[PDB]
Amino acid sequence: CENTISGCSRADCLLTHRKQGCQKTCGLC
Numbered sequence: 001c002e003n004t005i006s007g008c009s010r011a012d013c014l015l016t017h018r019k020q021g022c023q024k025t026c027g028l029c
Helices: 011-012
Strands: none
Touching: none
C-alpha cells in the first residue's frame, strides 16, 4: 500500500480529509 497522492506531509496525517490520499504518510498502512 502507498499514498495515492504526492506532496504528502506528516501534517497531512492530522487531516482526516487528506489521510485518505496520504495514508502511507499518515501511517494508516
